[PDB]
């Protein structure tokens, strides 16, 4: 939704959108199908051996 | 088994069963302030 430019809808019992359609939107916007990406170390500079998941969400401090 | 057998033999060591109740621990004469430190205080001190 951030790459698309719209507010995402997360209604529970919709059953009209699914992870396959979301991966299709990811492929449309050019990023990886399963949302993993390549991260780079801040100390050494070498790439992380494993792919790393990343992205926005909503957090709250208590 | 050391602790388990120790619990059971301390239960049965008085020649009879010992349910973990005031109704037993008041009957064994094992210290008036032990009895007071149990859930009933005033009656066991007051009888002592």
């Amino acid at each position: 939704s951030a790459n698309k430019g719209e507010i995402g809808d997360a209604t529970p019992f919709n059953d009209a959108v699914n992870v396959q359609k979301i991966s299709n939107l990811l492929s449309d916007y050019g990023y990886h199908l399963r949302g993993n990406e390549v991260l780079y170390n801040g100390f050494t500079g070498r790439k992380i051996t494993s792919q790393i998941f990343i992205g926005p969400t909503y957090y709250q401090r208590l | 088994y050391r602790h388990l057998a120790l619990l059971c033999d301390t239960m049965t060591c008085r020649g009879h069963l010992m349910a973990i109740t005031r109704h037993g621990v008041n009957r064994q004469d094992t210290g008036p302030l032990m009895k007071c430190s149990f859930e009933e205080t005033v009656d066991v001190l007051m009888e002592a």
Binding site: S23, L33, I48, L62 | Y1, R2, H3, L6, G31, S37
Partner: protein
């Protein structure tokens, strides 16, 4: 407050807003006695189950599992970065596993550098194949699933929860047994530091790509659940037209619900087996569960394959409404969907009805947790105030505040609960002929005595028949001991609790003294006796 995960593990501490208390003694002798009694290396191991309780936390556990995987080939710069964080390091670089084309060490070499002392142990991995044990390749592991360490050098095996955690006879447990508790503390700290740095280099994530499966196995799941659903509808129609024959011992209704439960359990088990067969071996779920850090093989099944049937009070969800679980269903139907079986997975999402059923299950678990904690607190208080008075006097017997003797020795053995260890006894269970062939030490077989003993030893044994009389007397004594063991254990169990692990002391003595048992023995049986 800043502290260690190895201390959180016995503390039941998990950093979600849990605060600790910190007392400081004022008196110097109280400070000294706290230092010398309640200190973490001095009380690594609990008495109640003679097991280590410090353990290794989940992240470092999964990281060290991926580090002790067989195919680890580590660059010289990374090994250079790693071997400062060993506190007990000698200061010399070890030989790389790979020298040509490039200098590359290995994780087993690094862990051998980590382990202090010289300890001999064999452990089994969580995915270790018992048929691989039974057949060939028992000393050449195809999957490196046999944890073997010798002389402080980790030979083979993928370490896991069963080898490094709170399990009895674990590596840290036998380390605390053999060398110093402070040395074992440094071993824990070194493990944490270097495994954290290797995890920092490696990286470990979880993602939808790890949680998703393939369409062919998805179709397998749909075919399996469709077969199960049509089968249970057939059973329901059988009960409707009353061809159902009731099992003796229960009513027709109980027989029918037993049939439904059996069918659903079999279907769910087949679904989980199919998924765990197809987890594709690059799943971080699989990797971490194999490390034993968290989760379970069934948890992969709920998150990936299907949630399954949820049970309230040990049965299906009852008819809260007028003979119906919900008004969304018809009256008098016994479908698994209408009664509480979930046909979907967490990835697939849930209908609101089965979401309500999962809420039923979660509320049932939470109320159980609350009443469990409250009642076990009251019961523990009752037990404490019951037996706040029992202690052992200097004559090694048990007396109360009334000084009445209850036990002549502590636990009728006078042996410490931290010191006692699991042991397997070979005297009980084998046949009389096997016992004779394993414990006789027959002196007539001259070739056997030439192979086992030296020439002076065999000539002295054959010359002195009094030695043979002592061996025969010992054999009669151990036969009587076998009779005594069969009396005391009518059950066919050879596991016992014993203060010493004599097989481990044999192994340690052998690898210390460098016996090389291919050569014949140099010790007399009369000296042994």
């Amino acid at each position: 407050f800043r502290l260690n995960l190895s201390v959180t593990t016995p503390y039941n501490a998990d950093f979600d807003g849990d605060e600790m208390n910190l007392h400081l003694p004022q008196s110097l002798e109280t400070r000294a006695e706290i230092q010398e009694l309640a200190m973490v290396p001095r009380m690594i191991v609990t008495p109640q189950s003679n097991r280590p309780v410090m353990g290794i936390v989940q992240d470092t556990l999964t990281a060290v599992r991926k580090f002790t995987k067989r195919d680890v080939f580590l660059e010289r710069g990374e090994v250079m970065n790693l071997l400062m964080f060993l506190s007990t390091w000698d200061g010399k670089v070890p030989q790389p596993a790979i020298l040509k084309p490039r200098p590359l060490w290995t994780g087993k070499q690094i862990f051998s550098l980590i382990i202090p002392g010289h300890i001999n142990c064999i452990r089994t991995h969580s995915t270790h194949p018992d048929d691989e044990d039974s057949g060939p390749y028992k000393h050449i592991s195809p999957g490196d699933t046999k944890v073997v360490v010798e002389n402080g050098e980790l030979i083979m095996g993928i370490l896991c929860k069963k080898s490094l955690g709170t399990s009895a006879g674990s590596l840290v447990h036998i380390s605390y047994l053999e060398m110093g508790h402070d040395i074992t503390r440094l071993f824990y700290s070194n493990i944490q530091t270097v495994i954290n740095n290797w995890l920092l280099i490696e990286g470990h994530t979880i993602g939808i790509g790890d949680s998703i499966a393939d369409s062919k196995t998805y179709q397998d799941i749909q075919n399996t659940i469709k077969k199960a659903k049509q089968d249970v509808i057939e059973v329901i129609e059988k009960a409707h037209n009353n061809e159902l024959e009731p099992t003796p011992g229960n009513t027709l209704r109980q027989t029918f619900e037993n049939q439904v439960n059996r069918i659903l359990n079999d279907a769910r088990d087949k679904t989980g087996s199919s998924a765990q067969k197809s987890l594709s071996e690059y799943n971080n779920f699989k990797s971490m569960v194999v490390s034993g850090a968290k989760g379970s093989k069934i948890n992969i099944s709920q998150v990936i394959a299907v949630v399954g049937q949820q049970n309230v009070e040990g049965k299906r969800i009852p008819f809260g409404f007028k003979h119906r679980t919900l008004p969304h269903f018809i009256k008098d139907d016994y479908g698994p969907e209408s009664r509480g079986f979930v046909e979907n997975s967490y990835l697939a999402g849930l209908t609101p009805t089965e979401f309500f059923f999962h809420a039923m299950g979660g509320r049932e678990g939470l109320i159980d947790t609350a009443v469990k904690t409250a009642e076990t607190g009251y019961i523990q208080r009752r037990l404490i105030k019951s037996m706040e008075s029992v202690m052992v006097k200097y004559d090694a017997t048990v007396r109360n505040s009334i000084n009445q003797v209850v036990q002549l020795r502590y636990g009728e053995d006078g042996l410490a609960g931290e010191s006692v260890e699991f042991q397997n006894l070979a005297t009980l269970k084998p046949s009389n002929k096997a016992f004779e062939k394993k414990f006789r030490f027959d002196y007539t077989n001259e070739r056997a005595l030439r192979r086992t003993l030296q020439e002076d030893l065999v000539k002295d044994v054959l010359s002195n028949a009094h030695i043979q009389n002592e061996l025969e007397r010992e054999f009669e004594r151990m036969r009587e001991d076998r009779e005594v063991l069969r009396v005391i254990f009518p059950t066919g169990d050879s596991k016992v609790v014993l203060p010493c692990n004599l097989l481990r002391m044999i192994w340690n003595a052998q690898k210390i003294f460098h016996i090389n048992p291919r050569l014949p023995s140099d010790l007399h049986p009369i000296k042994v006796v």
